[PDB]
Design a protein around this ligand. Structure first.
Ligand SMILES: C[C@H](N[C@@H](CCN[C@H](Cc1c[nH]cn1)C(=O)O)C(=O)O)C(=O)O
Ligand SMILES: [Cl-]
Ligand SMILES: [Co+2]
Length: 506
């Protein structure tokens, strides 16, 4: 039934641990790959650089503050209404009404106004010139376009009425926490999909997602926008051994790391000395080789040198238990017993991991047992990726697993996120010199000479590394399980989308 019924209907159903969330692409809770299926930006950012999309040609003034966009005249939203310069203006205006939500993306701080020149010409006026503007208008959020007809009283910051975009699929039926359909858009202006329907199906990871893939109740799987893979290696081995599934892994795209909350004045992780101690207690070589079964390489710094503007080797603290012990002694956390104490309190920490990531869970369990030998009670907590993200915002954590944001985002956007409420500001909020460091991040984004810019990033990361906020563990990639007879599965530069409209023969 399952796998052939879905080939006959030209259908993917993919397994995921979480629902698609709030499909308003002007905010950030909704699934990134889902939103990349229905919404589109003016321009896209390929490996060849900027390529036209909803804007076909565009002009740039000499002073660099005015961008003129000539728009396709053959684009309609999923509700019928036309995409035109007016539509572009209302969208960008609605986003800038809520620009506090977006300050991690510098372009939102410089957008002065949007002006309609005529039916299909729209003019973007900035307050300074800024060459990443094209790059940031190509991001999947927030500068993508929703049918103005769905605006709430001309606004999007407080939600939308329907979720109508210009993409190759349209949102169909969606059962909260159960499923969401992505029906082929027959009116799509560009490369029309060959699949009739991609459906998200929500279910726990582990055996229950493996079995559903084996029956063909789902036939597809990819690591989600929080880096969670619903199928571990052995499940991939068995799914390959059916002769029914293929598996593709992308180039490395990110660094997975432990995030340490310098702001949690509650806990010893607000003490720099302790942060430097535990940064010596993470045996990344053995994690990458035994815990992750060789599927990821160890990461020694936060951004690998294949990353733009990273031109330095800056290896972080190595696994060294003797250094760890002396730093904890220096901080007042002595061994009484093997447990470590200070002012009549045992050294405890609360660590958080995605309960849907089997690899985060096993890493959390390995670290718990390692930390016990040091005298630290590591209390580990398995939660949804969405609860992890909110702790990341509220700061209510001591340690958590996370990862960098990938090839389109590292290092510049991730580093900006060091000071963003919806980024990693909670974790850096306890650094004494955070004012200087935060101002360096704003300044580094102004430097045009690459080497002196690369040095600005280097000095920033050097201090962040010395503060022990981020313990890099391994380099993650994008993994896709797909029917063996499904063609044209490839990767973009983003870990947050897949060319669903290109895949074929199933
Ligand atoms: C704005 C900020 N970051 C970006 C880029 C990074 N996304 C990853 C993954 C993710 C999934 N859902 C939301 N963010 C992250 O925030 O860790 C975004 O979500 O569009 C955010 O999530 O609010
Ligand atoms: Cl040190
Ligand atoms: Co995000």
């Amino acid at each position: 039934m399952g796998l052939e019924e879905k080939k006959e209907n030209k259908q993917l159903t993919y397994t995921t641990v979480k629902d698609i969330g709030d499909m308003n692409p002007h905010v950030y809770g909704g699934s990134m790959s889902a939103e990349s299926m229905i919404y589109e930006p003016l321009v896209r950012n390929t490996k060849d650089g900027i390529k036209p999309l909803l804007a076909k040609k565009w002009d740039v003034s000499e002073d660099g503050k005015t961008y003129t966009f000539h728009l396709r005249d053959d684009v309609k939203f999923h509700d019928g209404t036309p995409f035109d310069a007016d539509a572009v203006k209302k969208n960008i205006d609605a986003v800038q009404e809520n620009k506090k939500l977006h300050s991690w993306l510098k372009i939102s701080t410089l957008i002065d106004n949007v002006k309609v020149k005529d039916k299909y010409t729209v003019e973007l006026n900035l307050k300074e010139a800024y060459q990443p503007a094209l790059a940031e208008l190509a991001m999947p959020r927030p500068y993508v376009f929703v049918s103005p007809k769905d605006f709430k009283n001309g606004t999007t910051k407080d939600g939308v009425k329907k979720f109508d975009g210009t993409g190759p699929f349209k949102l169909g039926e969606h059962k909260k926490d159960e499923s969401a359909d992505f029906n082929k858009n027959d009116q799509y202006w560009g490369e029309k999909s060959k699949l009739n329907k991609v459906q998200a199906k929500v279910m726990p990871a582990g055996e229950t997602a493996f079995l559903s893939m084996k029956k063909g109740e789902t036939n597809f799987a990819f690591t989600d926008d929080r880096g969670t893979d619903s199928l571990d290696k052995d499940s991939l081995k068995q799914l390959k051994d059916t002769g029914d599934y293929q598996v593709k892994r992308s180039q490395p795209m990110n660094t997975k790391m432990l995030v340490v909350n310098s702001g949690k004045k509650d806990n010893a992780v607000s003490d720099k000395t302790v942060r430097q101690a535990i940064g010596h207690m993470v045996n990344r070589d053995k994690i990458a080789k035994e815990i992750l079964d060789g599927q990821e390489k160890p990461a020694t710094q936060l951004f690998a040198k294949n990353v733009t503007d990273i031109n330095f080797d800056m290896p972080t603290r190595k696994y060294d238990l003797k250094k760890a012990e002396s730093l904890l002694d220096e901080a007042g956390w002595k061994k009484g017993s093997d447990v470590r104490q200070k002012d009549g309190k045992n050294l405890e920490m609360a660590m958080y991991y995605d309960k849907g990531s089997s690899s985060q869970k096993e890493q959390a369990e390995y670290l718990q047992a390692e930390f016990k030998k040091m005298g630290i009670k590591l209390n580990i907590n398995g939660e949804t990726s969405d609860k992890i993200a909110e702790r990341r915002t509220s700061g209510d954590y001591d340690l958590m697993f996370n990862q960098t944001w990938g090839l389109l985002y590292d290092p510049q956007s991730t580093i900006a996120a060091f000071k963003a409420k919806n980024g990693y500001e909670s974790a850096t909020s306890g650094i004494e010199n955070k004012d200087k460091i935060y101002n360096s991040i704003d300044d580094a984004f102004k430097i045009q000479n690459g080497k002196e810019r690369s040095d600005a990033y280097k000095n920033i990361l050097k201090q962040i590394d010395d503060e022990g906020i981020f313990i890099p563990i391994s380099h993650g990639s994008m993994t896709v399980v797909a029917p063996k007879d499904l063609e044209k599965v490839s990767f973009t530069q983003s870990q947050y989308e897949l060319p669903f409209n290109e895949m074929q023969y199933k």
